């Protein structure tokens, strides 16, 4: 069958057995920047094995009352090896990605996740005329969490699932490249994501390219003897990463 899928990027391999398909962006597969669309004049850096490989983020636990999670993604890979180091030493970065999310259960568990990959997810604030600190939009590989009700914390994102932190209807949030993790058919969700920005290259600290969102529509539910702890594990691999403008290490 076509439910078995295998992916090799570098020295890391993912073999799944209950996959569904692979969504590839808006039809475009990640490729390098041509000489017609190029702006800077100097030679880029293409590592291609030390960079283009799968990095595994933190596993998050999914209770019956969990509401959602998000990760900002040129920023959650800040401290992941030579991708993060090449981010820290260069000025201009450009890459595509491959987002694979693992979550397993049995045939007695039910539930349904929605894995969305949202470009330019400029989020709101809890207080309307207030500034958001950077530790709440992103935290690296540690996930932030949506809330079920109107959150009114200090210097924090408005965390309500029915607005996704962005002020839209969460049911209409399927216009972006998405899959579902349905626990009766699926086991995983692979999303290939090309580079989408208004400029050919951009700095990888000052900008947030996109935002992964995992929101459970059908709540997790099980009987009085099944396993309670169900993790959700996200693994990401940059694709066609190249770098420009070498200078000293820092971000200020």
């Amino acid at each position: 069958s076509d439910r078995v899928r295998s992916i090799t990027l570098g020295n890391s391999t993912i073999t799944t057995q209950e996959s569904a398909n692979v969504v590839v962006g808006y039809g475009v597969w990640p490729d390098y920047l041509s000489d017609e669309e190029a702006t800077a004049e100097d030679q880029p850096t293409q590592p291609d094995v030390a960079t283009c490989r799968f990095y595994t983020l933190d596993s998050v636990s999914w209770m019956k009352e969990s509401q959602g999670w998000w990760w900002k993604f040129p920023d959650a890979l800040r401290d992941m090896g030579l991708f993060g180091q090449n981010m820290q030493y260069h000025y201009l970065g450009r890459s595509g990605y491959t987002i694979h999310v693992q979550c397993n259960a049995s045939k007695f568990h039910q539930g349904c996740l929605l894995v969305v990959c949202v470009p330019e997810a400029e989020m709101g604030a809890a207080n309307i005329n207030e500034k958001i600190n950077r530790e709440h939009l992103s935290n690296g590989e540690v996930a932030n969490t949506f809330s079920g009700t109107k959150s009114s914390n200090t210097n924090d994102v408005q965390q309500a699932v029915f607005n996704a932190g962005m002020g839209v209807a969460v049911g209409n949030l399927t216009i972006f490249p998405h899959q579902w993790i349905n626990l009766r058919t699926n086991n995983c969700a692979t999303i290939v994501m090309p580079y989408i920005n208004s400029v050919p290259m951009d700095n990888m600290f000052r900008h947030y390219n996109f935002t992964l969102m995992i929101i459970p529509f059908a709540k997790l539910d099980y009987a009085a003897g099944s396993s309670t702890y169900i993790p959700i594990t996200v693994t990401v691999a940059p694709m066609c990463a190249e770098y420009n403008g070498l200078r000293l290490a820092g971000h200020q």
């Binding site: 596993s59 636990s61 049995s106 099980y222 003897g225 396993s227 993790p231």
Partner: protein, 59 residues
């Protein structure tokens, strides 16, 4: 045998996501592990095994 110069590395195994199990099914399970050589494998220098230990004959 062991020396500092030719050290090879570490095999490790981690939980990506947990073991989700339904009701009325046992939670604790068992993984078995296997090892073999590939088609590019080699050995070079004969010596005696460090395992054979006899003291007298086998009358």
């Amino acid at each position: 045998s062991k020396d500092i110069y030719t050290d090879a590395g570490f095999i490790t195994c981690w939980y990506q996501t947990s073991i989700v199990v339904p009701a009325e099914v046992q939670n604790q399970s068992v993984i078995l592990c296997f090892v073999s050589a590939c088609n590019d494998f080699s050995v070079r220098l004969l010596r005696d095994s460090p395992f054979v230990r006899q003291t007298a004959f086998y009358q």
